[model samples]
Target: SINDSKILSLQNKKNTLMDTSGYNAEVRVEGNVQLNPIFPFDFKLGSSGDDRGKVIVTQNENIVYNAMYESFSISFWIRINKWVSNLPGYTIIDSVKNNSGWSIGIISNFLVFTLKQNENSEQDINFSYDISKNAAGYNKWFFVTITTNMMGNMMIYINGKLIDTIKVKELTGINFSKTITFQMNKIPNTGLITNINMWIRDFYIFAKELDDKDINILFNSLQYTNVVKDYWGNDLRYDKEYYMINVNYMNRYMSKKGNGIVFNTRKNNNDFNEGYKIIIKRIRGNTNDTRVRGENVLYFNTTIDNKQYSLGMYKPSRNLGTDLVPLGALDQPMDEIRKYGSFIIQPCNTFDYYASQLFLSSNATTNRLGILSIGSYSFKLGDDYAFNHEYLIPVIKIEHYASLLESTSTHWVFVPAS
Candidate 1:
């Protein structure tokens, strides 16, 4: 059914396809999850306080799809929180009556695959396989998909990478029902669940198995759009799904594009303007050495101490010139290395949180500050010809400018003690 969309035909390298026409994606998260009537199954919508009872289902039905007939797939996304179980464990994807099961799930911070013969039946055994690599931070997103084909074999995917596979006597057994009427399938017998702050979507049930390329397309779509919902796309109300399941929405994120989306480039002398006096530091030597290492300099917050500053790469395009970039040094253009110049950034907008709008272009009252440069030495320029105060330029990396103050004892920027 998913192949019905033109996305499958374009064959270009694209991840997620935004339903730009709808002015939105079908499902999204805010403080909670949003479900569409698109899939006619029953689900028990999660709730605000019933942390344990928030599992949604496709209504009371005791059916599970068996893979014995052909290949199949299941995919979804999850967000996590502190109240959740920190100990990494296996999650149940599907289960049937008498405890017998044919399911897909997760373990070891990776997608784990499992199969069971029947509930309370000892030989009804257990099989485990890895699906994904674990990552730090629970609030981040992780996607899982399981596939089974005609030959009674299975493959598990996490974040688009294949992590595990197995061959079985039956892809779907009697223990595996024909249709499962649940969404939040749990671990067999045990009540343990990932306690989803996670959202699930793009679930596809196929009578046949899916190929690797198709799975990759699904993974890229997830990566491109970062989960298919826009809580931030518009001013909308918070629905119960996201909160009931611990997923966060982008509905309230307000970081604006600063400086009107400045084109990223290397500044050099040929394009340099002299009157406004801006300085840019260029890293002309080999990057392996001479590049600032560790926190030779640092910045301080009100209470936080000893934060290391990162010295990033210098782009010749953003510098006075970048001859080394193409055709080797011998072929370097004569004026190419000379384009680096001082940059004076003025406040385009007053709001500090929105850094994109922080700098103004050209000469105007909107200009708040300027970067003063004289060769490698630089400083912050002040209004009214005041040469008395300036913060020396330490390093320049395209849009990132830093104060060039390194101390003898530590790796943080400190107000030099007089």
Candidate 2:
């Protein structure tokens, strides 16, 4: 169970909860609630929504309240069941008729945001955003947040990514004097239209414009506020996954340690997964001239032609104190890993390709040299001639992928029953 006191606060930002399905009909919040009894709505755990919960809006009546905010932001997660294109214009959340304040709803199958300045003779600003254009599908839960500053700087975010921004030059800002009415899936011209089902959860209002980073934290954590942890105190994040190639040398002559290129994938298999490995070795010789030579090899397991290939680099040297350092093979960013099918590495590629290249290369142009374990070095150091030469070990590190997709699994923490 979620702790309402811990999660809910009203010192600076006011939150209203309609999650009550009990005899206590009072809406959970610090402000006053004017709930109409004619059009009844239900409160239940959202099936499409996360573990937090939701308010199933199917009413034509009004839920009115007053919140004092000069420049405000509104955030909520919603899932529209039916897309009614011909209901005149239905509201998901509205303050008053005729743009007395701000309102959000659907207009012609597009998500619309309207802001009405409370001042005199100022025209209302309406932003009609096409959700389908951004790959947002119907009947799916989307985290929506709209913010406006005192200077009429407006921004809209869906699922923590900034989708739209506008500058309202005509209006300065807005405030509420009278009670603002909230009606979901209903229109004043058409009352409550049928087939406009929507599930709303965690409605919030702030007197200040929430920053993009804060909104991102809210989106990642699925929390009402800008906190990364949920009610159960678990961090919600999909850490990036990494595959590391390490090179080490252990010999009677000298020893060294270093890291190499890394492969990356999504945190979970629901997105995508692949496996690859690398090996490196140093070869010493019986002849005095061929003291040290190094070999770097790689194998891509899931490739169409799964072949083992040795990384070629310029210059192999072995000075006693000088350690072999890996750098980019051809003065390129190490993060530019070659893709299997696309053959093009996007700027948003998962693994740190540039960094990996640096590790694999000896310098900007050369590869590092080392002593090999299984070499023809017959005349060694007397009794203790048996020694461990350069050994290459491949490891894996899972990390947070910077980009997010619909198939990406959300981090969920358990919250005990209250």
Candidate 3:
């Protein structure tokens, strides 16, 4: 979708958020629940003015909740205000209907989860967790998650660490509809515990069972805003860090062949010369350039043949017909490099964001950025010959609208270095 023509069509098939109207859920609080002052929308259960504090969710038509009967993930942030010693009671989640379905609660400082196959099935899976072992004690926030696959396999994670795994039965698409009650529910003990001393928020329920990496992203997202979930590539974290900039279509990664930055096939992220430091270009703020508006310019820095150089539209083709890049001089003053060496890193314009394109800030001639042309031309400068390395290089070209489907080669993903 260069410039904006084909982008609308490419974005049409993007994934919509799960909280859309059809699968949306409604929450009702019994009695008064405390409100989190920091994250104001977070549910504050079991505090001052909070008696019989409970967050209830009616089944309704929310298929996302019903998806728990299949492969699903339940992730949330929890903080307990108090704990009971001998009394084994404190319902965290009680979704039982006619003594079937599933439920989880705290009993004697132990987090317990129970799930049954069906009303007539004789198997019941009880998952238990100790207080400090799973980091569920104290008045601090803890990210806890539980996942289940329809094949009767389930797993628990605490702070992104897998804590336990178990199997119950190979249940299929069984219908499980019930009212889910969470937070401080009534217990059969002395009954003096009016409400649950817990603060819960940042809750998420997915129909897909998230793996370790996704769970890590979810856990880290609470701390870092840039830690996000994306379909195309890894999120950029910081400057100065090198990354494996790759393309999505052919599963190929960008590396060096000669002077021009080229894409190589099936190269691992840690492969030789696969790292490129992408530094955001300033708006000629301190530079002596005449332009004031920043094009979100970026610089690609890498070491080619033991020499540090910036990769861009450079001169002195180690071959001559068309001026080519000969590994830009890193020592060049920023005053000139800011305008010539830096390139625009423009992501495709779309409702659903994906790849970025490298554009020449100096060229306003054509709308095309850099195209990976198919043919190669042999150019010679006094017998020092080069053929553009028989790889992908910059080209200003265009194609018909329908041919844009083959435009994936022009797209790029800056994969964070692992």
Best by lDDT: 3
- Alpha-carbon local distance difference test for all models: 0.30, 0.35, 0.48
The lDDT of model 1 is 0.30
lDDT for each residue of candidate 3 in 1-418, tens digit (9 for 90 to 100):
0111110000001121112223344556667665544331356666334365666665454463446656776777666654533334766766776656667766555565666546665343333434322221233346677777866578887778787788757544345544667666545763453333676665665666778988877776655332221122223322433443334323344455444554445553223234354433343222333221223444555555676666544543545333223333344555656555655544442212234555555542223334322223333222345443344444323233234335654454443334
Off by over 4 Å in 2: 1-69, 84-88, 97-99, 118-137, 170-181, 185-194, 223-418
- Judging by lDDT, tell me the better candidate of 1 and 3: 3
Give the range of the ten consecutive residues with the poorest summed lDDT in model 3: 4-13
List candidate 1 stretches off by more than 4 Å: 1-68, 82-92, 106-110, 120-136, 170-173, 178-196, 221-418
lDDT of 2 by residue, 249-366 (tens): 1111111122122222224321111343222222212223211111212212111134333222222222111232222112222233221100100111111111111112223223
Can you give the lDDT of residue 337 in candidate 2? Answer: 24
Superposition error at 251 for model 3 (Å)? 54
- Candidate 1 local lDDT, residue 223: 42
Tens digits of per-residue lDDT, candidate 1, 1-418, equal 4543211111011232122222122322123323433221112223233332222222112212333345556655443322132334434345454556465544434344455555533221222222111111232334566676546667776556666776756423445544232233344544444344334444444434656787777666644231112111111111111110001111111110111101112233222111111111222212332222211111111111232111111232223332211101111222332232212221111101101011111222223222221122221122314343222122222232344112111111111111
- Single out the weakest 10-residue window by summed lDDT for candidate 1: 349-358
